[PDB]
């Protein structure tokens, strides 16, 4: 059955550092106010060592990160101890996948894809994808990774665009100005680790009917040209509908039938998560995501849990989409799709 | 000359909060830089006193966001005393217009445009602005207030819903999922006030002469119809081209005009900045207002000060727009144009 790495100690420690929210707490409270934990193999992360945040990072990035970790910004106090905590979140999941525990392994917590060997960027410090990724290395040969967070995952694009090892398929918005910027479907990866880099630049209003096609022919493509043997996928919910960000019109539901479709490979998949600036409803979608996993279908009725009363005003699990359009034309996505299909040709 | 309210003790307050990353150090740094503050009246704030921002928070309201500063996240600390501070010198502008010591009276950390006499909105806690407002009533009679910021200064449109003593007119964006969510053209004002709240809805990727043209029909009618004798203007920075936002598509020069027309009409104006969150971006926006409001033209180059590193790598205070249409179907922007010039008949 799946395993979901929590403990009380890590939900609060990711509910601290001065601009961070209980987005941990409001998370785990529904899976739990739902009793879907109770149909999951918890394990209690590990925190990662310097040693294994050093697989990818530069050990003078990390021992900087700490050297500031506790003076603050004189950049707050306690990301390394933060990162040190997700970090061994990740690699516990991959651990555990890794040892035929699990085929599925959660750590809603992770997902931040923005840093690098040695630089942090979009408020990540640590690419816990990328230690998760080297962990199931170990016996996973070929690693696929897929990111259906609203931001490209260009940290782990990036850690990986020179091995044909490791592939990246990154859906993300792209648009001259939206953060990070990187992610141009002509971004295919450099020397051998070209081809085996995926990115599908999509627009704003993309709801779950054109934004599964998209996700399900590529994935499709990418599958049988590259044949993976393990799968991280990143689930950031600032695609659903109501987040700040106001850019996709998603709902769990759609992420749900992309869930779904790498879920059948039956393959080892660590989920993440990544963004998710509307709390109550990120807690709605990834509920709800834990839901599909366990194949059980969830009431509609918000429990009465410690963080109820935000699930206003209609206090349901659905999410509807905005009344916004969808700027994707829907033969450029056919042009995207074709160069990717292309670009895949070049995949063995 | 214009008064420009800076402290040693108000930028140190405004530069920290936990999550309040160093903006007000930057517009600072610059404006000083460009040596702009030598024209200018340099004017310390004063802190507001409880009966001060009681002039529109609710005692209750005061006492519970006091009560809390001083706890922390157990919101942080500070936040009540950071409302004071930066409400005490939206007070002390106003009353430098009050007494005819200057025309324009400056505050750029101030426009916290979303707050409510006893809720806080939108990171706003205290709202500045009204209070700003309220002490022109003292010797003014009809205050006109305009929000340029990307948002809908809701805030302030509420506190004046039922008085025609106060018109407040906000170009923002408004689309299903944007927050705050109100700000349709249909919302006019209530009972006594019909007619004395303007808003005008735009989409993304407006740039500079579309949004100037629109601002100054709005503002004339506003004007000749309402007749006013004083301006709050707020400025939120988070409509220039890069902005995390990614909405509009504007440069400091089309906000810049919108300034200099309010500007034509001779009244005491009272500035507030507001939204920005491309902190290298607003400080230059500022300084490039700041630098109309005296009327001279700046360095193209960035002088060399402390945050210079930040304004690389083409180090120049201009700003180019960003590769993404403009959605303002031009048929659909008259619509509006014309509600709006019909609803200021209904003026006195
Ligand atoms: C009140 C307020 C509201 C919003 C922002 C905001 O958007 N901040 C902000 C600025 C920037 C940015 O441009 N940087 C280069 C760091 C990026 C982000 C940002 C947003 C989302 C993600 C993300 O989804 N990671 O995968 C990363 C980074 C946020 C700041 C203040
Ligand atoms: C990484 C990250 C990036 C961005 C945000 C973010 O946008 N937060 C966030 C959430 C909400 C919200 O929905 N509320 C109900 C508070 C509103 C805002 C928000 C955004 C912009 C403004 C503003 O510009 N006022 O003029 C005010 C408030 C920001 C949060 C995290
Ligand atoms: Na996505
Ligand atoms: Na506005
Ligand atoms: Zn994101
Ligand atoms: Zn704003």
Redesign the pocket.
Same mark, same amino acid.
């Given at each position: 059955v799946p395993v979901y790495i929590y403990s009380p100690e890590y939900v609060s420690m990711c509910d601290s550092l001065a601009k961070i929210p209980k987005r941990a707490s409001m998370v785990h409270s529904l899976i739990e106010a739902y009793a879907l934990h109770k149909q999951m193999r918890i394990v209690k992360p590990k925190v990662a060592s310097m040693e294994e945040m050093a697989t990818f990072h530069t050990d003078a990035y990390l021992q900087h990160l700490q050297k500031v970790s506790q003076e603050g910004d004189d950049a707050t106090e306690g990301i390394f101890d933060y990162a040190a905590a997700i970090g061994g979140a990740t690699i516990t999941a991959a651990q555990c996948l890794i040892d035929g525990m699990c085929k599925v392994a959660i750590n809603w917590s992770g997902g931040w894809h923005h840093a690098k060997k040695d630089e942090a960027s @979009?408020?990540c410090y640590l690419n816990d994808a990328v230690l998760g990724i080297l962990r199931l290395r170990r016996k996973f040969e070929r690693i696929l990774y897929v990111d259906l967070d609203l931001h490209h995952g260009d940290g782990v694009e990036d850690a990986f665009s020179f091995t044909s090892k490791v592939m990246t398929v990154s859906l993300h918005k792209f648009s001259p100005g939206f953060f990070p910027g990187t992610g141009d479907v002509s971004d295919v990866g450099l020397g051998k680790g070209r081809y085996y880099s995926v990115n599908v630049p999509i627009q704003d209003g993309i709801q779950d009917e054109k934004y599964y096609q998209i996700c399900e022919s590529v994935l499709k493509e990418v599958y049988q040209a590259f044949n993976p043997k393990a799968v991280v996928l990143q689930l950031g919910a600032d695609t659903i509908a109501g987040?700040?960000?106001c850019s996709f019109n998603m709902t769990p539901v759609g992420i749900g039938k992309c869930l779904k479709y790498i879920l059948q490979w039956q393959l080892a998949t660590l989920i993440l998560g990544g @963004?998710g600036?509307?709390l109550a409803n990120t807690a709605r979608c990834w509920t709800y995501l834990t839901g599909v996993i366990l194949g059980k279908t969830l009431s509609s009725e918000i429990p009465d849990h410690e963080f109820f009363t935000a699930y206003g005003p209609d206090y349901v699990l659905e999410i509807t989409p905005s009344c916004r359009p969808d700027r994707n034309e829907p033969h450029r996505i056919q042009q995207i799709l074709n160069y990717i299909k292309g670009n895949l040709k070049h995949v063995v």
């Open positions: @979009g408020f987040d700040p960000m @963004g600036y509307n």
